Amino acid sequence: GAMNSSNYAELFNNDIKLFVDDTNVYRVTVHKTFEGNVATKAINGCIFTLNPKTGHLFLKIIHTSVWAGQKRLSQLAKWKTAEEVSALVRSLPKEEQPKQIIVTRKAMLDPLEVHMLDFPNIAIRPTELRLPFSAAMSIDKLSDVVMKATEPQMVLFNIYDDWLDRISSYTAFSRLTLLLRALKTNEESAKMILLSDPTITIKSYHLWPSFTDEQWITIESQMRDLILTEYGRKYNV
């Protein structure tokens, strides 16, 4: 059924699974028209499909042309997400297909279930975890590829860089979610923490800086402090 804190280690077992987050598929800016009405302008979005055990991220870029002439875009976005995830599954070899797909928003359950009727043994599940995947577009290299896209495109990343050479998947996912929560809560300060030391760089083939084990400990502490600081600012604590 639903995925939560009680069954959290299930994310790192040997059954292939993917998280699907649709929060950046349909992105708009709102503006006034010449007549003083309000209009939206869509911008390129993305589906965030992540294997939490291996770090493989299937980033499907959603180009604004897919909305052209369509109505009820927020509804369509869910069905387009389900269509694209179904297509990804069918494109994978049998032994790489997921056994479970966990959607971060419950409104994706029926669209995905309907698109995956041909795969009755792939479980489609919600989660009670509040995951910060909406902040994926705060990772500079992900935002850049989405914004530069001129057509639909799929780009593959490892969202954990080389961390699994040194840490477990559980720990990698915990680091990722802490980083993304910090970027969601205070993006400018989080980015400052990550780049405050010019001598630590991001390799061409990586998304995050090349921190040593001890430096990651310091960074993680600074991220927790940022989150707590913002909590006190928000609630006057």
Partner: protein, 300 residues
């Protein structure tokens, strides 16, 4: 007019005949029901006084044979049987009528209720949902499960309603996922009407039969089927006008006949609120919407 005699009434029982109900005491000199209108299916149903468990009954049409009821003390129920000896049957009936040991199907002349509830219900279609080919009448009870309930356990004793499942490959064309899930017109018009039922009369017949089994036996799977068949229509953007107008009449008479005190167990709040206020057909069921709002405004 036709007659269903009873050999006797050895156990105290509430007997119902279509929408009417009456009590018979243990060993009361009761020998059946006369004046049953020819031209419709009928249902004779039972609930034992000493054990309200298992309501059960029999759907029948007096044009198909001469039927009577006889209590079986081994299986502990009133059983319908066919009498093939016509002159014997007529003589039995005539004597019981002369001794005035029968009740009369009390149809008020102005009252079209039973026709309105069974307009599309045919005995031949009942006998395909309830499979027991050696009898011309069909036994139903409160506990019988439907073929769909079983898929989710004795198949010979099942209700073979047409399976409706909105999240099934039958309901959703590959490549038309969003279209077919948000607008069930394909599933209604091509799959169900043209494909399985052949016409709207057979579809309404099954819908009406499901409602009646839900109401008269408290059969849960029948209630599920009745609501699914309503929702399939209401959730379709493209429905022939004659079907929508007929559905409004069908549902109106069903809601009118439902006992007020059973509304909590016979009406699905989700389905009705969706059908009357959110669905494509939210404005096509004026008569049903009016009676629902006046009779069961709490449900809404």
């Amino acid at each position: 007019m036709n007659t269903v005699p009873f050999t006797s009434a050895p156990i105290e029982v509430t007997i119902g005949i279509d929408q009417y109900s009456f009590n018979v005491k243990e060993n009361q000199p009761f020998h059946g029901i006369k004046d049953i209108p020819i031209g419709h299916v009928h249902v004779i149903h039972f609930q034992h006084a000493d054990n309200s468990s298992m309501r059960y009954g029999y759907w029948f049409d007096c044009r198909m044979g001469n039927f009577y009821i006889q209590y079986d003390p081994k299986d502990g129920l009133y059983k319908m049987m066919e009498e093939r000896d016509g002159a014997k049957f007529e003589n039995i009936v005539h004597n019981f009528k002369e001794r005035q040991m029968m009740v009369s199907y009390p149809k008020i002349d102005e009252d079209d209720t039973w026709y309105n509830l069974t307009e599309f219900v045919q005995m031949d279609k009942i006998r395909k949902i309830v499979r027991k080919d050696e009898n011309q009448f069909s036994y139903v009870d409160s506990s019988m499960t439907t073929v769909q309930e079983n898929e989710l356990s004795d198949p010979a004793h099942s209700l073979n309603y047409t399976v409706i499942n909105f999240k099934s490959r039958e309901a959703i064309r590959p490549g038309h996922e969003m279209e077919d899930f948000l607008d069930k017109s394909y599933y209604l018009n091509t799959v169900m009407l043209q494909g399985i039922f052949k016409n709207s009369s057979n579809y309404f017949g099954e819908l009406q039969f499901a409602f009646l089994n839900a109401m008269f036996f408290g059969n849960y799977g029948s209630s599920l089927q009745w609501h699914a068949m309503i929702e399939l229509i209401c959730s379709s953007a493209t429905v022939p006008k004659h079907m929508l107008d007929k559905l409004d009449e069908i549902l109106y008479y069903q809601i009118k006949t439902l006992p007020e005190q059973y509304s909590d167990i016979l009406l699905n709040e989700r389905v009705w609120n969706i059908c009357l206020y959110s669905s494509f057909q939210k404005n096509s069921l004026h008569n049903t919407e009016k009676i629902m709002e006046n009779k069961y405004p709490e449900l809404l």
